Symmetry: C3
Subunit: 362 residues, 3 copies
C-alpha cells in the first residue's frame, strides 16, 4: 500500500538531506571560515619603520639636472652621460648624492621631568643605498623606540656646509616602509616617498596599523622575511628578462655586471619603470602574514634649527590598531554541527555504527 | 504511583524546553544576526569624491557683502535686494560668484621615473551649481584616479585676473561628498565644507573608509542612487511645506517659480535653514548599503604657484578601510542548532514524524 | 568472542569522547569568548575631552627658569628655591603660572546660514589646577558640543597684556584626556601633552575612537569613575611609599602637609617621576570597558588674531569609530553544541536519564 512508498520516501529524503548538510558543513570547515578582531593596543615601546630618504627622481633632481645640463644633454637623456669615457653608471648615480657623510639619526623619547629630554644620537645611524632615484640614505631602525609621552620622535639631521660654493638641493623624498623590505627602498622610494622641502623643516607623524592574517590553505601567507626575498627576486628577474640584456644598474643586486653603454642602461631603466608599476598584482609572491601600515600625517615644527637638512618623524600616538584574523569553526564546532544535522532528521549515532558492523561481522 | 507523575513531568518539561530553544533559535535567525569584518584593501585606482567648492556663506562672503552693503542694506537682509526692480533672486545669487569660467581640474598621478609626472588637465572639468552658499563649482569625478605613488592628487586651479580692478575674495569652502548626492552639494556645502584661504594655497589629504551594510528586513538599506533621490525629495518637500509658499530659490529644483519678493525668499531661506539642521535624523529615507567616508587631513605645500585659486587634494593613502557587515547564522546553522536542541533532551527525529503520520493514516 | 570486546570498546570510547567535547564546550563557554563589532556612528552632538593646558615642564619653562636663574641656582635645582625663607613650595609652583585669570573657553558650532556663527563664550570656563609641570588650566567639558558642520571647535583664548614689561612665554602644552581622570591632568600633562607655540596660534583636530569592552570574569572592567579613583589612589600611594617621606607637593591631594625643605621636595618629585613612567603597566587597577581615544591631528588656521594665547580645537569629524566587544556563545549555543556532541556519538537524551532515574527508584 501507500505505507511502503511513504516510509521509503521519508527515509531516502532524510538520508539525502543529512548527507547534504553534513557535506556542506565539512566543505565550509575545509574552507576555513575566518573572522576579524579589531583592537587598539597601547604600546610601551614602538617599532619604527626603516625610513629610506632619497632625493627627487633624476629628472626632478635640482642639483643633478643642473650639473647634467651643463654637459649639453637633455632633461631625459641623463643616461647618455655614460657614453663619455670618464663618466660611468656608478659615477653618474653618485652625482645624485644629496646627503653628505655627516648624516645623523637621533632618537628623542621626551620624558623625565626631573632630567629633561632623552636624546640618543646613536640609534641605527644612516647608511648608503642605491635607489632608482639616485644615491639615497637608509635607516635600519635597529631597536624599537621607548614611548613615554607625545614627544617621541626620530630626527634625521644633516649639517653639510650650506653655502654659495655650490647650489643647494630643494627637497628630499622620505619613504616609511616595512622593517626589512630591501626592495621597497631600492625601487619604490621615488613613488611612495613623500616629497618634503629641506629649507623649512617640518615633521611627519606616524600612526601604526597592524594586520595579522591567518595562514589558510586557500589563501596562505608567509613571514615578513620570505615575502621580501620573493618579491625582490621576482622584480630583478622580471626586469632582466624584459630588458633582454645582461647588465644591471646600481640599484640592482650584484648578479650581473654594470651597464656600460647608454642603450643598455636605458633599456634596464625603462624595464624597471614598467616592472615597478605592476610588481604587486602581476606577482605570485604570497602576502606576508603580518602587514604594517604607517599612516603618515603632517606636523608643524615651531622651532626651526639652522641645520641644513632637519627632518623629525613623530610617534606621538602609541595606540596600534591591530586587526587579527582568527579562524572560527573549529573541529568541535564541526562535530557538533554534524551531530545536530543527523540528530534532527535520521537519528543514527556513532554508537549504532558499531552495532551495524558487529551485525555484518556476526 | 509516583512513576506516572515523574514521567509525565519529565516529558512535559522536556517538550516545553525544546519548544523554548527551538523558538529562540528560529526567532534570532529571523532577526538575522550580523557580524562585521574589517580589512584594509590596497587599491590600484582610487574613487575620488565629487568635491563641491563654494564661496563662504552670504554673510561671510567678503566680495558679496562688500557689494550688497554699498546698496545700503544690512548684513542680514541681503534678500531685500530683490525688492529693487533690476535685482532678482537669480541676479542676487549670481553676484556671489567667486570662480570664473577659467576653472580647471587637473589630475596628477605622480609616477614615471622615466617620463616624469602624469598631468591630466581634462578630468571631469568643473561645472556650475547653485548652492545655499551662492553660485558654486562642482567636480563630478567622472573617472577613478590610477594610484601609483603618494604624489596622486587632484588640483583645482583658477587663474582669474587677480588685480586691483576689483576686491579679491579671501577664502573658499570645499566639501568632499559622495558622487551622486545632488542634495549634499546643493544644501550642505556651507555647513560640512572645510573653509580654506586662497591667498596661501595648501592641500588636503583624503583617506577613504568604506562601510558595506547588509540588507536586512529589520534594518533595510538601499543603493547609493535611491537614497540620494529620496533625501533630496524629502528636503525640498519639507522646505516647501514649512515655508508655506509656492516659490523656490536658485538652489532648488525647477519645480516651482522663483521667489520674486523679499518676504517669500526669506521664508524659503529660513525654511531651508531649519530643514538642513535635522534633515538626516528627521527623515524616513533608509540608509544606503555602501557608505563612503572621506577623512580629510591637512597637508603642507612647498611650492606655491602664482595662480589665483590653486588647491590640491592629495590621495597619497591607497589603503581603504573596508568594514563589511555579513550575515552569520546561516540556515544550515539554524538546522544544526535545532537538531542539537532536539537531541540533548527529547530524542525525536524528522524520521519518527513520518512514522507518526503513517500511524495516524494507518 | 570478539563481539563483547568490540561493543565494550565502542561504548567506552563513545562515552569518553562525548565527555571530552562536552567538557571542551562547557570550558570554552566558561572562558566566555567574545567578538568585536566595528562601526562608524555619526553623532549629532560630540563629547569633548577635558583639555588640560599646562606650561612646559619646569626645566623647559622659559619664563620660570629665566627668573629662577636670576636667584642663582642651576637648571636642575629649581626646588632648592624652597630653602629661602620667602619662597615655599606653593610660591615656587605659583611662579610657573602662564595663564592669567582672563582665560576664556568659547564654543563655536558654526551653522545657521540665516543667523551666522554660534559663539558660546560660557562653555565650562577654565579653572586652576596644579600639575607636575607647574600651575595649569583645566577645561572640565561640562556639556557636549552640538555638531552641525565642520566648523565645530572649542577656542581657548587668553588676552593678557603681552608687552615688554615682562618676558613672554614661548609655548604651552595641551593634553586631551578623558573627563573625570584627575590623575591624567595632574601627572601626565607634561608627558602626554602636545607642545604648541603661542606666538603663532594654530588649531588641533580631534577624531573620536571609542572601545567598549565586555565585563568578563577573566577580564573584568570598571566604570570610568572607579578606574580614575583607583589609579589616582595607586599613584599617590606609590609616590608616598617610594619617597619614604611624609610630605607632598602641590600636585598631590591634601592628604599630607606640603614639603618645606629642598631634600623632601626633590625626593617626592623624583618618586613621582619614577612612578609615572610605569604607573599603568605596574598597576592592578582593572581597565575601563569604555575607553575613549582622541586622535589629535593638526590644522591650519588662516586668520590669526591679535590675542595673546589663542588655540582652537576643531571637531570637524563627527564619525566616532565605535568598537563594541560583544559576547558570543550564549547559553542556547552551548546547549545546542552539547546536544550535537551527544547526538552524533551516543544517543542518550535528557529524557532517557529520567527513565534511568525512575528505574533506579522503581
Amino acid at each position: 500500500r501507500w505505507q511502503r512508498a511513504l516510509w521509503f520516501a521519508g527515509v531516502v529524503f532524510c538520508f539525502g538531506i543529512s548527507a547534504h548538510q553534513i557535506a556542506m558543513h565539512v566543505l565550509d570547515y575545509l574552507s576555513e571560515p575566518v573572522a576579524v578582531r579589531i583592537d587598539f593596543v597601547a604600546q610601551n615601546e614602538l617599532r619604527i619603520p626603516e625610513i629610506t630618504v632619497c632625493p627627487r627622481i633624476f629628472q626632478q633632481n635640482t642639483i643633478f639636472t643642473d650639473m647634467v645640463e651643463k654637459q649639453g644633454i637633455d632633461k631625459m637623456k641623463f643616461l647618455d652621460l655614460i657614453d663619455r669615457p670618464e663618466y660611468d653608471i656608478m659615477a653618474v648615480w653618485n652625482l645624485s648624492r644629496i646627503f653628505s657623510d655627516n648624516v645623523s639619526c637621533s632618537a628623542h623619547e621626551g620624558s623625565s621631568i626631573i632630567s629633561g629630554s632623552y636624546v640618543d644620537p646613536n640609534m641605527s645611524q644612516p647608511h648608503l643605498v642605491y635607489t632608482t632615484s639616485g644615491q639615497c640614505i637608509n635607516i635600519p631602525a635597529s631597536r624599537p623606540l621607548i614611548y613615554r609621552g607625545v614627544n617621541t620622535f626620530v630626527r634625521i639631521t644633516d649639517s653639510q656646509p650650506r653655502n654659495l660654493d655650490e647650489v643647494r638641493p630643494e627637497a628630499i623624498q622620505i619613504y616609511f616602509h616595512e622593517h626589512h623590505h630591501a626592495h621597497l627602498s631600492r625601487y619604490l622610494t621615488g613613488l611612495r616617498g613623500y616629497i618634503v622641502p629641506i629649507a623649512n623643516p617640518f615633521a611627519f607623524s606616524i600612526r601604526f596599523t597592524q594586520i595579522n592574517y591567518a595562514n589558510r590553505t586557500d589563501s596562505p601567507c608567509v613571514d615578513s622575511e620570505e615575502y621580501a626575498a620573493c618579491v625582490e627576486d621576482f622584480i630583478e628577474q622580471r626586469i632582466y628578462e624584459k630588458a633582454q640584456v645582461q647588465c644591471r644598474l646600481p640599484y640592482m643586486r650584484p648578479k650581473l655586471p654594470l651597464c656600460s653603454t647608454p642603450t643598455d642602461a636605458r633599456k634596464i631603466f625603462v624595464a624597471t619603470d614598467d616592472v615597478i608599476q605592476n610588481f604587486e598584482k602581476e606577482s605570485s609572491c604570497k602576502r606576508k602574514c603580518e602587514e604594517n601600515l604607517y599612516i603618515v600625517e603632517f606636523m608643524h615644527l615651531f622651532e626651526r634649527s639652522n641645520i641644513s637638512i632637519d627632518m623629525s618623524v613623530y610617534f606621538a600616538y602609541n595606540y596600534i590598531q591591530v586587526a587579527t584574523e582568527y579562524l572560527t569553526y573549529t573541529l568541535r564546532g564541526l562535530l557538533s554541527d554534524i551531530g545536530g544535522v543527523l540528530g534532527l532528521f535520521l537519528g543514527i549515532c556513532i554508537l549504532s555504527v558499531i552495532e551495524v558492523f558487529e551485525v555484518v561481522i556476526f
